[PDB]
């Protein structure tokens, strides 16, 4: 019993974190095999971030300008290349702690753990989600760039995010491990506003199923709805539309609780229309949307 | 920017987790040096939990009845002893991954990270606090016993909690690493109700300071209060009394923001009396109390 914002154990990812320095800029890198992945803005000064031409700025850098430090020992850089917004630094030593890994590009609504790092050293681990406007609501300070987001399936770490920047509104933007940003963001100090941060409906439904499994049942009502009727109310509340794919994804939770997906939708509709009335669900006064249906099943079953 | 429920990196603690089996019971153990620490109820059957005499039940167990498995390799048990509600199993091999460590007993209001484990394998990491009624609101399932709670100061892991049981209300109870339970709980399947779960006032004030540092300032008002006036309102809302020690602990946050501690108290008093009015603070519709003043400073400064 109990439902917590739980992150994956970070050990496998801590063993990959290195410090990358280029001139006066120091950020974090991810060392997998003989390659160190880091944001390409490590080659910039603060003045370059205004209008950086990364191809031109990179010409003025050689292998020896990139200082990679793993623990307190220096790694020899024997090659460097730019792939989209990340630099790949070929080092002469393969990471002895390289776990089994994949590079995946996640969809909005999908959650992942972040190991926030400073100077190649981990400071914390927390769970977050790719927002539908392709930002992440993380907890990052200066020097956090290069910190990664990941998921684990038994012994395979799927890296999905690398942190690049904080937008003027305090929200965060970054890339997958191929250097492609999530959303329309660019690695420049320029006016970039985020779109609407809608609520991930399928995740709220999953957390409502987690609440029923953990004994919070006050919000269960006598009603049902249809996907179209539900989506009319969801649109009005800046909630993502719910599809038959989402209903299918919620099937196992529907089976665990005996509560049909559309009945849970009607319950959610009444919570949107009536409010919580000062009550809480799983120790929260608002509807949580950063737990996917897979996260609820994993947490309630004990996947290790 | 951004404020998250952040847990310490779990790597150092994952390297200590082992599986302990006694007869038909399997739980987790913490392997530090040549000692494995685990809940003493590993020697019980489900029927023994009703009225267990641990000294008598332990007589019927020898070193070879305790099966310690680290990874997929068996550890040889060369000694066993009971210390309060934990068993200490002396093994013939010292944990090669033993980090620098301390065993500390924390006070209510203090927070710690939990690495939830099943069969000696980690499943997740989350942050929680020792409630003022000495329970913890964790996320634990059957077999989670022996999972530990800890804090890290650079390279030293201070172990403070070991999970033992879930109370009938879904809340959790456990011991420090000397086997002494937090609160009045006992390791028996018996009616044990928790006391009042009051809000940790000094932690709410710390999180209100975190909100001001991260740009959420709507709740800042034109008032001030005194410790006595504030505590009259705090008592009425089931909030812990605020002491001059708490005011002192909040000093660095008071300095960072330029907002006197008693001004923040007046702001908190108005939030208690008026409510949030549908607004949020750091993405929360309720006042968060599981971030200590030290956690806010650490997260906002980037301690690694
Ligand atoms: C102007 N600037 C600053 C350095 C770096 C940046 O955003 N770093 C940071 C990341 N996350 C939180 C922060 C919190 C305070 C300070 C920096 C933070 C960056 C990166 C890009 Cl791609 C563009 C601009 C830019
Ligand atoms: C009756 N019983 C069950 C096994 C064990 C116990 O509480 N285990 C569990 C711990 N945390 C969550 C759980 C969730 C579902 C099931 C067990 C859970 C235990 C331990 C003590 Cl000290 C006393 C009684 C008792």
CB B31 within 8 A of CB B18: yes
Q: Angle formed by the axes of helices A261-274 and A201-213, to 10°?
A: 100
Q: Catalytic residue numbers of B?
A: 41, 145
Cβ of residue A191 lying under 6 Å from some atom of ligand 1: no
Sign of CA dihedral B277, B281, B283, B287: negative
d(CA A105, CA A94): 24
Is the same domain home to A111 and A9?
Answer: yes
Instruction: Report DSSP state, residue A238.
Output: T
CA distances from B296 to A54, B248, B291, B300 (A): 36, 15, 6, 6
**In terms of DSSP bridges, do strands A100-103 and A156-166 run parallel, antiparallel, or are they unpaired?**
parallel
Q: Which of A24, A126, A166 to mutate to test the pocket of ligand 1 (most atoms within 8 A of CB)?
A: A166
> Testing the interface with B: which of A7, A28, A128, A289 to mutate, by most B Cβ within 10 A?
A7
Backbone angles phi, psi at A150, to 5 degrees: -155, 165
Q: Which of B165, B167, B183, B186 to mutate to test the pocket of ligand 2 (most atoms within 8 A of CB)?
A: B165
Which domain does A39 fall in, by range? 15-99
- The nearest CA of chain B is from the CA of A276 a distance in Å of 10
- Residue finishing a domain among A155, A174, A197: A197
d(CA B74, CA B65): 13
Q: Which residues line ligand 2 (CB under 6 A)?
A: A 1; B 41, 49, 140-142, 144-145, 164-166, 187-189
Q: What technique solved it? A: X-ray
**In A76-207, which ranges are E strands?**
77-83, 86-91, 100-103, 111-118, 121-129, 148-153, 156-166, 172-175
Instruction: Report DSSP state, residue B51.
Output: S
Token pair, residue B279, equals 């607004």
CA A73 to ligand 2 centroid distance, Å: 46
CA A176 to ligand 1 centroid distance, Å: 17
Is the same domain home to A2 and A150?
Answer: yes
Is the same domain home to A7 and A155?
Answer: yes
Inspect the interface and report whether the beta carbons of A8 and B124 lie closer than 8 Å: yes
How many CA within 13 A on the CB side of residue B217?
8
CB B241 within 8 A of CB B235: yes
Tell me, yes or no, if A69 comes closer than 8 A to chain B by beta carbon. Answer: no
- The nearest CA of chain B is from the CA of A275 a distance in Å of 9
Is the same domain home to A33 and A113?
Answer: no
The secondary structure element, H or E, covering residue B150 is strand B148-153
d(CA A37, CA A57): 18
CATH, residue B182: 2.40.10.10
Q: Which of B3, B139, B300 sits opposite A6 (nearest CB)?
A: B139
- Residue finishing a domain among A33, A65, A99: A99
Is the same domain home to B9 and B109?
Answer: yes
CA B261 to ligand 1 centroid distance, Å: 31
d(CA A163, CA A37): 11
d(CA B23, CA A205): 41
**Beta-bridge mates of residue A62:** none
Q: Which residues contact A25 (CB under 8 A, 6 or more apart)?
A: A41, A42, A43, A44, A45
Is the same domain home to B121 and B250?
Answer: no
Is the same domain home to A2 and A122?
Answer: yes
How many CA within 13 A on the CB side of residue B39?
26
CA B109 from chain centre, in angstroms, equals 9
Domains contained in chain A, number: 3
* Resolution in units of Å: 2.0
d(CA A293, CA B242): 41
Is the same domain home to A147 and A261?
Answer: no
Tell me, yes or no, if A123 comes closer than 8 A to chain B by beta carbon. Answer: yes
Is the same domain home to A113 and A186?
Answer: yes
**In terms of DSSP bridges, do strands B121-129 and B111-118 run parallel, antiparallel, or are they unpaired?**
antiparallel
Is the same domain home to A191 and A288?
Answer: no
CATH, residue A268: 1.10.1840.10
Most distant CA pair in chain B, distance? 68
B188 Cα nearest atom in ligand 2: 23
CB B266 within 8 A of CB B221: yes
Q: Which of A1, A125, A140 sits opposite B166 (nearest CB)?
A: A1
Is the same domain home to B1 and B139?
Answer: yes
Burial of B48 (0-12, 13-18, 19+ CB in 10 A): middle
Tell me, yes or no, if B79 comes closer than 8 A to chain A by beta carbon. Answer: no
Q: Which of residues 137-196 of B touch A (CB under 8 A)?
A: 137-144, 166, 170-172
Tell me, yes or no, if B116 comes closer than 8 A to chain A by beta carbon. Answer: yes
Q: Is B33 left (phi over 0), alpha (psi -120 to 50) or beta?
A: left
- Residue finishing a domain among A70, A99, A128: A99
Is the same domain home to B178 and B216?
Answer: no
> Testing the interface with A: which of B72, B121, B123 to mutate, by most A Cβ within 10 A?
B123
Backbone angles phi, psi at A127, to 5 degrees: -100, 140
């Amino acid at each position: 019993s109990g439902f917590r914002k739980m992150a994956f154990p970070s050990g496998k990812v801590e063993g990959c974190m290195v410090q990358v320095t280029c001139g006066t800029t120091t950020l974090n890198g991810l060392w997998l095999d003989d390659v160190v992945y880091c944001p390409r803005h490590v080659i910039c000064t603060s003045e370059d971030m205004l209008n950086p031409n990364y191809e031109d700025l990179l010409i003025r850098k050689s292998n020896h300008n990139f200082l990679v430090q793993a623990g307190n020992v220096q790694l020899r850089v024997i090659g460097h290349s730019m792939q989209n917004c990340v630099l790949k630094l070929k080092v002469d030593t393969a990471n002895p702690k390289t776990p089994k890994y994949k590079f995946v590009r996640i969809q909005p609504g999908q959650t992942f753990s972040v190991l926030a790092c400073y100077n190649g050293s981990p400071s914390g681990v927390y769970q977050c989600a790719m927002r539908p406007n392709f930002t992440i609501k993380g907890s990052f300070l200066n020097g956090s760039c290069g910190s990664v987001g990941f998921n684990i399936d038994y012994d395979c770490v799927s890296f999905c995010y690398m942190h690049h920047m904080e937008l003027p509104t305090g929200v965060h933007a970054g890339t997958d491990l191929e250097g492609n940003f999530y959303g329309p963001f660019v690695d420049r100090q320029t006016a970039q506003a985020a779109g609407t941060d809608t609520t991930i409906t399928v995740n709220v439904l999953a957390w409502l199923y987690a609440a029923v499994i953990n004994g919070d049942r006050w919000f269960l009502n006598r009603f049902t709805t249809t996907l179209n009727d539900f989506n009319l109310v969801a649109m009005k509340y800046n909630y993502e539309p719910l599809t038959q794919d989402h209903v299918d994804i919620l099937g196992p939770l529907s089976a665990q609780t005996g509560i049909a997906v559309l009945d849970m939708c009607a319950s959610l509709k009444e919570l949107l229309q009536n409010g919580m009335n000062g009550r809480t669900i799983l120790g929260s006064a608002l509807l949580e949307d950063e737990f996917t249906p897979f996260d609820v099943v994993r947490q309630c079953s004990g996947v290790t």
